[PDB]
Each structure stands twice: as C-alpha cells, then as structure tokens.
Amino acid sequence: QEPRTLPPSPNWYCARCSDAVPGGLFGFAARTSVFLVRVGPGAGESPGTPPFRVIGELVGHTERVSGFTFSHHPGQYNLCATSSDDGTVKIWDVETKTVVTEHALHQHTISTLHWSPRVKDLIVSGDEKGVVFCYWFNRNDSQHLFIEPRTIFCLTCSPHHEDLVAIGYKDGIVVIIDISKKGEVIHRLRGHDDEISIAWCPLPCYLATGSKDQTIRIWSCRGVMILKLPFLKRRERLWLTLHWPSNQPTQLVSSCFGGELLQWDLTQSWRRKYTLFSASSEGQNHSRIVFNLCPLQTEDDKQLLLSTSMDRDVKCWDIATLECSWTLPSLGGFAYSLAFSSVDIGSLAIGVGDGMIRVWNTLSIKNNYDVKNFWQGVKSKVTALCWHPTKEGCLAFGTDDGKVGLYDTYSNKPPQISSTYHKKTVYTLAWGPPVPPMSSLALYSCGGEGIVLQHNPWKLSGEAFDINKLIRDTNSIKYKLPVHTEISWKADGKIMALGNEDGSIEIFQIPNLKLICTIQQHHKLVNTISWHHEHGSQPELSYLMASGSNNAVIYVHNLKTVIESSPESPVTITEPYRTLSGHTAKITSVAWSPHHDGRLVSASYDGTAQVWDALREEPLCNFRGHQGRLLCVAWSPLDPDCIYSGADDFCVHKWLTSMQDHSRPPQ
RNA sequence: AUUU
C-alpha cells in the first residue's frame, strides 16, 4: 500500500555525514546523494510498525558526499549543507530538495563541515591540507583560515561561543580556534596519538574527543579524564564517534570495537563505568564499526539515536531502553538481480555488487525492511539469482567472475559452489528439466562468453555440461553455434528459449533440445526473455514470449502455432506478434504480471520502468524514481499495483502504479 | 577506505 526504498549505503570514514533535526528528519550521505528519512508520528506508520519512512533525496553533487549537517536554528531546520569530493559546499532546502547557494572555495578534498549552533548562516568546512572556510551563506561572505599543515578529520563549532571551533586532525592533534582572530589557537589539546569526533559538553567549557587510539579524552578549557575503550566479546580498525546528550550531560555515548555502542557514566569517572546498548536482546547490535550517531527527539518526545555503520545498516536506538527500535538496511552496489520465491511468498532475493545476497521478507507484518544478508562463498558481484521452484530455501546465484553457487537460506552453512566456472559474468540462472547427458530439475547458467552450462544441483562440484554439444548433435549443425546471452524456460518445462548475441532467439523442445523455431526480430544482443504465466483467463497466453535487447523496442511473440505443430524442420519467424515502443535505451529486464492477462513491465537504461498492456500495445505507467539505469524488475506477488525495480543507483524501489504521474517513457 |  505505500512505496519503499532500499537506499544506497551511508558513506564510510566520514566524521559527520549524517544529522537529524527535531520532529523529525534524518539525513545521511550515501554515494553522491543525501537521503532523507522522516522519523516519528510524522512518518504516519501503523502502531507497532517502525515509525520511519524514506521520503526524499538531495541530488546534484557529482562525486562522493563527504559531509552533511542540518541547521539547528528554530524555523530553519529545513536548511542543511553538504560537502563533496566534487569540490563544492552546497546549502540546500529540504522542503524543495533544491540548492539555495553553494561555493567552490576549497582546492583540496574536503573532509567535513558543520553548521554553527550559534550563527544562523555560518557553515565551517575543513579540508585534507588543513584549510578551513567560514561561509556566511546568507550574506555572501567567506573567510579562509589555516591553522596547521595537517589533514583535518573532524570539526565541531561550539554550542556556546559563536567564535570557537574545535578541529581534530589525522595525527591526533586537537585545537580550539577563534574564528574572529584569524583562527588563532586558543587551546591546544595534547594527548591523542592517532586520528581524531569532537563533542562539546552541552552546558556552558569541556570538550570530549574520540580517537583511533581507542581512547575518549575529556578536556577542560588540559585533560581531565582518559577513558580507554573496553574489550568485549564479539556478538577493520576502530572508528570512535561520540554523542554527548544535551539533556543528560553526565552521560556520553560512544561507538566501540565492532560497532557496539556504549553509554558512559561520567559521574563514575574513575571506574570507567559504561552500559552496553542492546545488552539483553541478541543480534541487534551492529556487527562492524559505527561512524556517526545522530540524536533525534520526536514530536511525541521519544529520545532516539540514529547510528550509521560499515555493516550497511542504519539503526534507530531508543535511549530510554538502549534497545534497537528499528533497522534500515542498505546496498553497497548495483542491484543487479531480483527474484521472488514461489515457495515462500514475498521472499525477495536481491543480487548486489557489494558481494552479499539479500533476502527481503517483503511481507513481514511489523517490518517494512526485514532483510537478511548472505555473504559466505559469494565474494564478488552477484549478477544473477534464481530460487528453486519447489524446494524451500534453495537459492542459485551467479557472479561477475563466472561463479555459480547454490545457497540453502534456511541453514547457516556456506553455499555449494560449481567446480566449472564461466569465463565471464553469469547473466542468467534458470531451472528446468535435465537434458542429455545429465540424469528432478537441473540448474542452467548462461555466461557472458556465450555458453550455457547444465549443472546437477545435487553434485555441484561434479561435471557441468555445455549444452551446445547436445544442440549440435540433435540438430546436425555444422557451423559454430551462436553466442548465447539469455535463457528462459517456458513455465511448463517443455520449451527452452535462448537469446543470442546476434539478436536471434531460438526455441528448443525437450527431450533433446530439438530446434523448432528461430525468431529473427532483435538486431542486437538479447538481454531478457520471459514467458507468460499459465494462470490467466485464456490458456493461449502461456505461449506468449516477451523479449528485450540492446535496442529500445520490445517484442512479444506468440509461439502457439509452432509449438503445437511440432515441426520436423525449424520455422523462422520474422514478424512480431506485438511491438512495444517507447523506451529510449536498452532493455535489461522484462516481466509479466502474475495478476493480469498480457501485462508486462520492462526495465531500461533510459532510467525508467514501464508497464504495458502488451496485447493492446498500450503503455500504461512509467516509473521515474530511480536516478540510475535499471537492471531488474519484478512484480510484487500479492499487490497487482506494486512493482520492485533495481538499478545501478544502488537502490531498490518498491512502487505503486497508482502513484505514478506518467503513462509512457520520456521522449 | 567499499561507492563499477
């Protein structure tokens, strides 16, 4: 009933690239964007379901976003600033998602930036050579400052004194400077011996600093307290970030080894007293280092804390209980592949370019983002996935290095791996009946080099057969076989279609892959073939076959006549049954609606997905939410109006045809 | 230090 977005992962090793304002709104830098998430009653979630929603994106930087900071000035919580490896500092208005103004004053990679808690239009940024800019965005003024010739890691403007800024460097140096006196160093805080977070005591000073040296140091405007991180059982090097809660100044929250969060008790100074977050609940803690911690006080006054992590989860912590309220997962690579299980309805496998398979339990009642990760034996970009049609938990996958594997997602065992590799990327995986020389279902894998292998899913480490030998023998072929780029079995298991590099599609019949038809329609490499399902209103529809190539135009063919005549010599088809025009770039994926007769969705490099009434050649609905090139699409199993798509923007969107404003792709 |  509402959209969802699995977004790109929060950027790593950035001291402040996420922030939140009251009510409220969380933003996080991810790749070249900032993603915005409404949190609390304003998200409008059912009681029990986590009160967050992904609501927007700040689009316009051309390289990695390294910094993000909201304004914390009442009445302008809608303003925020970003830094980027594109060299710019931008001021944005999240109401319109547009740039207010920006500068390109830095000449070296920007490290971070901070919006002044005291001056309404002042943003202070710092770079890898040590240069600092003060930017008063709303009066067109700026000032460069240069304190020490060292790489800035972090910077925090005082909450109390408008001229005072603390800066932390790569080498462990910390300084408090006065920006009204050309950045004069007012205090040099000597103590740390490796990379510097800086949090000021929220009552009027003390500063706390967190370091790669595994210490938190609390200083006076001289050191007053050194806290070494504890070594705890597990359940990269350290990143040590801090949140000093403004309403509980005797508490200090830190990250720790492995992404554990601690609440330190500053009253019990000496004894290094802390309380571990999530200490009761099992497996809700982060599993890798935490980079940023952002407090968010909701309008119903719940105190929350958002964490970002190298584990690719964003977690929301309830400060009253220190338990995890909810988790938003994210993706660290292209979304190459989507596959829904026929056995466990709603179980959605996603093949991602960060080397981890995701299985999204899409129908989870109380969680819109119930995602589990599978990393064992994967280790490269997962470019193809296909669930077994009847065996629960059985997930085939393929990779950009030619590897084919079989997961049991109901176990914790590493997957079985095929001993035979493809030379190139595994494009497609499909189950179907075995064919000679193999002896219920075989696994078929098509690689970019053009071979389709038949694997025995019980003996994966055994022999896998190039099906071209059977095709050659059964059809008495003398010349070299086409370079196969796609495989798709008809739903009855009786006909295999191969799509080829030269654009042709070939139709083969069991048992021996006798060729019965060649379709010559596409003039470029075939990327996707899909056969219509068998549960529509007329049996004729199971003969419909949609296909897409590196050209924009989609075809449907109707293979009833040829299949039913079982010819002794093959037929050539050169006219389409239906033609679907509208896209403006290559077609990566086509899928038929299981809820309708003759309804198709297509994904394109044009950045859109299109829903078609294929039988009337009528475009119905065009989705434009992705920023990237779409690679995969799949209809939701229970909602006729809901479709999932994945793209090279590192996003998976779940979207509703009823909420989309266009009927056809951009011209 | 991942972001094709």
Side-chain angles (χ1 to χ4, degrees), chain A residues 2-181 183-221 223-232 235-267 272-280 283-301 303-365 367-371 373-378 380-390 392-412 414-422 424-458 460-513 515-537 539 541-567 569-574 576-615 617-663 665-666:
Chain A
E2 317 275 10
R4 299 168 206 200
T5 295
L6 223 48
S9 290
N11 294 334
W12 301 346
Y13 295 116
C14 294
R16 190 190 284 105
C17 70
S18 76
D19 196 14
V21 282
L25 186 67
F26 173 58
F28 68 93
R31 292 182 100 218
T32 67
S33 304
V34 177
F35 288 81
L36 305 167
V37 178
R38 179 78 54 203
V39 184
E45 274 296 333
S46 311
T49 309
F52 76 89
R53 188 178 311 274
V54 182
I55 63 95
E57 185 178 355
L58 310 181
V59 176
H61 281 297
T62 54
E63 289 176 73
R64 172 186 82 122
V65 174
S66 49
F68 178 72
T69 184
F70 272 113
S71 173
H72 297 253
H73 289 279
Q76 285 181 6
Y77 293 142
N78 61 299
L79 293 180
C80 62
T82 50
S83 67
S84 174
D85 291 355
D86 70 16
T88 66
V89 169
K90 302 185 192 327
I91 312 300
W92 310 74
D93 181 345
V94 304
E95 284 170 10
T96 58
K97 310 201 297 164
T98 55
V99 175
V100 177
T101 189
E102 68 182 79
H103 76 70
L105 301 165
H106 286 277
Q107 302 181 77
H108 310 286
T109 306
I110 299 165
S111 301
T112 197
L113 82 179
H114 192 217
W115 199 301
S116 169
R118 294 294 269 193
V119 183
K120 281 183 85 171
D121 71 334
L122 174 49
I123 291 81
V124 182
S125 62
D127 72 33
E128 64 155 40
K129 292 298 186 184
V131 181
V132 170
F133 282 91
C134 300
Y135 180 42
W136 294 269
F137 84 84
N138 212 23
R139 64 193 88 182
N140 198 242
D141 291 335
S142 67
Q143 185 61 65
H144 66 259
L145 305 172
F146 187 83
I147 326 305
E148 289 183 40
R150 331 173 166 288
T151 298
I152 290 172
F153 262 50
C154 58
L155 178 155
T156 309
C157 300
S158 173
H160 308 307
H161 297 124
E162 66 184 355
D163 299 326
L164 299 184
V165 175
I167 301 169
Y169 295 94
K170 179 164 169 190
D171 62 0
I173 294 295
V174 177
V175 295
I176 302 168
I177 65 168
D178 185 328
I179 69 180
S180 81
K181 299 171 171 182
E184 182 186 339
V185 169
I186 304 312
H187 302 289
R188 169 187 302 272
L189 299 189
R190 197 176 276 91
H192 289 289
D193 66 352
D194 214 336
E195 299 174 357
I196 309 304
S197 164
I198 306 175
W200 296 82
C201 189
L203 301 204
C205 25
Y206 295 101
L207 207 70
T209 54
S211 173
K212 184 180 193 215
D213 75 7
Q214 315 125 35
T215 75
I216 298 159
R217 289 171 193 244
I218 306 189
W219 315 82
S220 177
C221 319
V224 294
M225 207 189 302
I226 303 162
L227 303 174
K228 270 195 175 190
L229 293 181
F231 289 82
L232 303 170
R235 48 151 216 160
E236 71 265 0
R237 301 278 302 267
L238 175 60
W239 188 270
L240 213 182
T241 197
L242 296 176
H243 155 58
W244 202 332
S246 46
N247 67 342
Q248 287 302 345
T250 69
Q251 304 187 325
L252 181 60
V253 174
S254 86
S255 63
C256 196
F257 309 98
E260 297 278 19
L261 304 176
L262 309 175
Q263 188 189 263
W264 296 88
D265 178 352
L266 301 188
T267 70
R272 274 177 62 274
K273 176 58 169 79
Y274 56 84
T275 305
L276 182 63
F277 280 54
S278 209
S280 297
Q284 281 307 334
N285 51 285
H286 288 282
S287 60
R288 324 258 284 165
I289 54 169
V290 162
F291 296 113
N292 288 181
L293 294 172
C294 311
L296 192 167
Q297 176 151 235
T298 52
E299 68 203 46
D300 61 8
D301 299 303
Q303 280 301 350
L304 304 174
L305 190 62
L306 296 118
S307 60
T308 65
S309 168
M310 192 180 197
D311 67 18
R312 306 191 182 282
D313 283 339
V314 174
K315 287 177 176 291
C316 188
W317 303 91
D318 179 312
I319 289 294
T321 64
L322 311 178
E323 294 306 325
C324 178
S325 312
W326 52 261
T327 298
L328 171 61
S330 68
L331 305 186
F334 299 174
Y336 284 102
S337 181
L338 293 164
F340 274 114
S341 171
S342 289
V343 186
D344 296 339
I345 297 310
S347 189
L348 178 60
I350 315 180
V352 189
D354 59 18
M356 295 197 293
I357 297 161
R358 307 306 196 287
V359 179
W360 191 352
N361 174 16
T362 65
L363 298 174
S364 179
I365 292 163
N367 185 350
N368 292 310
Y369 301 89
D370 184 1
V371 179
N373 299 341
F374 296 83
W375 62 268
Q376 292 183 90
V378 178
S380 46
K381 306 172 179 173
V382 180
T383 44
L385 283 174
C386 192
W387 288 111
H388 195 279
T390 65
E392 72 191 4
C394 185
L395 180 59
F397 71 92
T399 74
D400 201 46
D401 59 35
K403 193 164 82 201
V404 170
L406 202 57
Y407 253 101
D408 177 356
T409 63
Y410 280 40
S411 79
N412 62 357
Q416 294 168 58
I417 302 300
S418 172
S419 299
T420 318
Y421 277 66
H422 289 271
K424 308 196 167 151
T425 300
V426 184
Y427 288 171
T428 298
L429 288 160
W431 296 93
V435 293
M438 182 73 81
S439 78
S440 212
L441 295 178
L443 174 62
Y444 292 86
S445 61
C446 186
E449 79 293 336
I451 299 304
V452 168
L453 298 170
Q454 186 194 193
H455 309 260
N456 182 341
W458 291 74
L460 267 206
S461 64
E463 294 189 326
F465 310 114
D466 176 354
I467 62 171
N468 277 349
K469 173 59 152 111
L470 172 63
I471 290 169
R472 177 184 298 287
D473 291 350
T474 298
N475 302 289
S476 308
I477 299 166
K478 300 282 178 310
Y479 186 50
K480 71 205 194 173
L481 288 197
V483 175
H484 314 306
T485 56
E486 166 66 324
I487 175 168
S488 175
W489 280 95
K490 192 171 183 292
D492 61 11
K494 300 186 170 149
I495 297 287
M496 172 177 80
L498 295 184
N500 298 308
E501 181 175 56
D502 71 1
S504 66
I505 299 172
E506 290 173 308
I507 308 302
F508 303 92
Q509 205 152 54
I510 58 163
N512 292 347
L513 300 185
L515 172 68
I516 63 167
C517 186
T518 302
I519 299 163
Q520 279 160 214
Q521 212 76 70
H522 297 282
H523 301 310
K524 282 197 170 95
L525 179 148
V526 179
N527 292 306
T528 178
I529 297 175
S530 195
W531 290 88
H532 194 287
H533 64 74
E534 291 188 323
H535 60 258
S537 87
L541 303 157
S542 45
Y543 290 109
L544 298 182
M545 187 198 70
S547 62
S549 76
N550 282 346
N551 280 322
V553 60
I554 290 165
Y555 299 112
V556 179
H557 294 85
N558 186 343
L559 290 164
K560 186 194 203 310
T561 302
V562 70
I563 289 169
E564 281 177 356
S565 74
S566 202
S569 65
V571 179
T572 300
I573 288 166
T574 59
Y577 181 70
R578 301 288 186 271
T579 301
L580 307 177
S581 311
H583 283 294
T584 67
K586 69 172 262 169
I587 302 307
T588 55
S589 182
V590 297
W592 292 101
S593 179
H595 308 281
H596 302 90
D597 297 344
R599 200 171 278 189
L600 195 70
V601 65
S602 53
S604 181
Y605 263 27
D606 76 15
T608 78
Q610 181 69 38
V611 178
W612 314 81
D613 179 335
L615 296 173
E617 304 185 344
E618 189 168 29
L620 307 179
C621 203
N622 192 251
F623 175 65
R624 308 181 180 189
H626 284 278
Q627 286 291 303
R629 297 183 295 183
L630 279 73
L631 305 170
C632 54
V633 61
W635 225 283
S636 77
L638 300 188
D639 180 355
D641 189 42
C642 185
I643 298 172
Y644 294 75
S645 53
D648 75 5
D649 53 18
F650 298 30
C651 291
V652 172
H653 291 294
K654 181 189 195 289
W655 51 271
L656 290 201
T657 60
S658 69
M659 300 184 48
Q660 305 316 310
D661 280 3
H662 306 88
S663 75

